[PDB]
Design an enzyme around this catalytic site. Structure first.
Site: not given
Ligand SMILES: COc1ccc(-c2nc([C@@H](C)Sc3nc(N)cc(N)n3)c(C)s2)cc1OCCNS(C)(=O)=O
Ligand SMILES: COc1ccc(-c2nc([C@@H](C)Sc3nc(N)cc(N)n3)c(C)s2)cc1OCCNS(C)(=O)=O
Ligand SMILES: O=c1ccn([C@@H]2O[C@H](COP(=O)(O)OP(=O)(O)O)[C@@H](O)[C@H]2O)c(=O)[nH]1
Ligand SMILES: O=c1ccn([C@@H]2O[C@H](COP(=O)(O)OP(=O)(O)O)[C@@H](O)[C@H]2O)c(=O)[nH]1
Lengths: 231, 231
Positions: A34, A99
Site C-alpha cells: 500500500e 489493500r
Molecule cells: C479526527 O481526526 C482524524 C485524524 C486522522 C485520521 C486519519 N485516518 C487515516 C487513515 C486511516 S486514512 C487511509 N485511507 C486510505 N485510503 C488508506 C489508508 N491506509 N488510510 C490517517 C492516515 S489519519 C482520522 C481521524 O478521524 C477519524 C474519525 N474520528 S476518530 C479517530 O475515530 O476519533
C-alpha cells in the site's frame, strides 16, 4: 493471466507482515504494498504523501478528499506497474495487493464522510472520480479473490503500539471498531452495496488472525493455497 | 480521423460566441462546450459543479485544488464523449474544444497556486494527477491545433456584465489582467514550456475579438478555414 488477490485488514491487522511472508514462499508470488505505508516513514510522491499524511492527521476535514484521491491515485499507479513489470514468465503468477481501491473508497473514504471529514459534495465528487477512474484507467486491476485478515478491533489496538509510529499512537479504539464494522459488512456479511458488479461474485477468504502467526503461519498459507487452487 | 482544435482565450473573450458560430457553418464541425461554463447558469456532475463553483468563490484557498481536479476530469470526460460519439464517417471532421486540459493546468491552476490559493503540495499533487490522468486515460485528446482569441481585460469585464451572471458579476479587473498575461505568454510569446513537449510545435492561430463579430465574423472564419487547411 496474472491473478490479483487483495489482502484486506484493519490497521495493524498484520497485512504487511503476512504478504512479506507470502512473497518469500513462491517465485511465482509477488506483492504490491500500500503506497500510504511508504508515506509513513525520496520521490515526488513520498514528499507529497508525507506532507499530505501529516496534514491529514492534523486537520482531516480539510484534507480528507485531497489525501484520499491521491492515495487511490498512487495505489492504481503502483498496481498497474506491478502488473506489467513483475512476474515475467512465471507459470502460476499471483499478485498480492496490500489493500485495494475498494478499501480506499468503501472503508476509509466512506468512514471520513460519515465522520463528517468530507461534506456531501466532496464525497459525491470523490465517488464520481473513483467510479469513472476504474473504467478509463484501471480495468486490469479487478480482483480475482480477497484475503480478509480478520481480527477484533481489540487485537488491532494491541498491535499498534508494537510498531511504534509516533502518529498512530494517537489512534483510538472506536475508530478501529468502525473500520472493523465496515470490513465485516463488505467481507463477512457481504452486506455492502457497491457500484462494482463483479465484486458480488468475487471469492473471499476470511482468516482469523488473532492468534500470532509470525512463526506459525503454515495453516494460514495452506488455506491461501487451497483458496488459490479454486480460482 | 477527427481534427482536434482548442479554442483559447481570457474569460468573456468570445470563445463560446465563436464556437457556436463555427458550429452552424459545417456538419464536419462540432463543439465541446466547457464544463465550468456549463456549471454556470442539472445532472450529478452539474449538481457537484454548482456547489464547488459556488464555494470556489466564497473561499478559493480551500476549494481550488478540488475545483481544478473536477473541472479537468469533467473536461477529459466530456471531450472523450464527443471524440467517440460524433463525427462518425464524416469527410472532414473537426472538433472544437472550449479550452483544454492545458488551460486547466498552465492558465488557471497555475494562477491559483501563484495566488497562494493552493499550497505546494496541492499544486504538485495536481501536476502529478494531471500528467497521469491525461496519459493513462486521455492520449486520444492530443491537439492538432490551437486557436487563440485575443481580447482586452476591459472588453471582457464589459461582457461579463452583458452576459449577466451575478455569480461572476464584479470579477475584479485585476483578476482578468493576470489571466490575460498567462494567455499572452503561453500562446503568443511562447515563454511557457509545458510538460507536453509537442505543444511547442503545435500551430497557433490568433484572432482579435475586441470588436463585436456576432453579426460580422466572415473574416475570422476565413482565417480559421485557411488555418485548418495547414493542419
Ligand atoms: C479526527 O481526526 C482524524 C485524524 C486522522 C485520521 C486519519 N485516518 C487515516 C487513515 C486511516 S486514512 C487511509 N485511507 C486510505 N485510503 C488508506 C489508508 N491506509 N488510510 C490517517 C492516515 S489519519 C482520522 C481521524 O478521524 C477519524 C474519525 N474520528 S476518530 C479517530 O475515530 O476519533
Ligand atoms: C480570490 O477569489 C477568487 C474567486 C474565484 C475565482 C475563480 N476562478 C474561476 C475560474 C476562472 S478557474 C477555472 N479553472 C479551470 N480549470 C477552468 C475554468 N473554466 N475556470 C472561477 C470559476 S472562480 C478565483 C479567485 O481568485 C483567483 C486569483 N485572482 S488573482 C487577482 O489572480 O489573485
Ligand atoms: O502475526 C502477527 C501480526 C502482527 N504483528 C505485529 O503487529 C504489527 C502490525 O504490523 P503490520 O505492518 O504488518 O500491520 P499492517 O498495517 O500491515 O496490517 C507489527 O509490529 C507486527 O510486528 C505480529 O507481531 N505478529
Ligand atoms: O463579439 C461579441 C462576442 C461576445 N459578446 C457577448 O459577450 C458575452 C461573453 O462572450 P462569450 O461568452 O462568448 O465569452 P467566453 O467566456 O465564452 O469566452 C456574451 O454574452 C456575448 O453575447 C458580444 O456581445 N459580442
Amino acid at each position: 493471466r496474472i491473478k490479483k488477490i487483495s489482502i484486506e485488514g484493519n490497521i495493524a491487522a498484520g497485512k504487511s507482515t503476512f504478504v512479506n511472508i507470502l512473497k518469500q514462499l513462491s517465485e511465482d508470488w509477488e506483492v504490491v504494498p500500500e503506497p500510504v505505508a511508504r508515506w509513513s516513514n525520496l520521490t515526488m510522491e513520498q514528499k507529497n504523501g508525507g506532507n499530505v499524511l501529516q496534514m491529514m492527521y492534523e486537520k482531516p476535514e480539510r484534507w480528507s478528499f485531497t489525501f484520499q484521491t491521491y492515495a487511490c491515485l498512487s495505489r492504481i499507479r503502483a498496481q498497474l506497474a506491478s502488473l506489467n513489470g513483475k512476474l515475467k514468465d512465471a507459470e502460476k503468477p499471483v499478485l498480492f495487493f496490500e489493500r485495494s481501491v475498494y478499501s480506499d473508497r468503501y472503508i476509509f473514504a466512506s468512514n471520513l464522510y460519515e465522520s463528517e471529514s468530507m461534506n456531501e459534495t466532496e464525497w459525491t465528487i470523490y465517488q464520481d472520480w473513483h467510479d469513472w477512474m476504474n473504467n478509463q484507467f484501471g480495468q486490469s486491476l479487478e480482483l480475482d479473490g480477497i484475503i480478509y485478515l480478520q481480527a477484533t478491533p481489540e487485537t488491532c489496538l494491541h498491535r499498534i503500539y508494537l510498531r511504534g509510529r509516533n502518529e498512530e499512537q494517537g489512534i483510538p479504539l472506536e475508530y478501529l471498531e468502525k473500520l472493523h464494522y465496515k470490513h465485516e459488512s463488505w467481507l463477512l456479511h457481504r452486506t455492502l452495496k457497491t457500484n462494482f458488479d463483479y465484486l458480488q461474485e468475487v471469492p473471499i477468504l476470511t482468516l482469523d488472525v488473532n492468534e500470532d502467526f509470525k512463526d506459525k503461519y503454515e495453516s494460514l498459507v495452506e488455506k491461501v493455497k487451497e483458496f488459490l487452487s479454486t480460482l
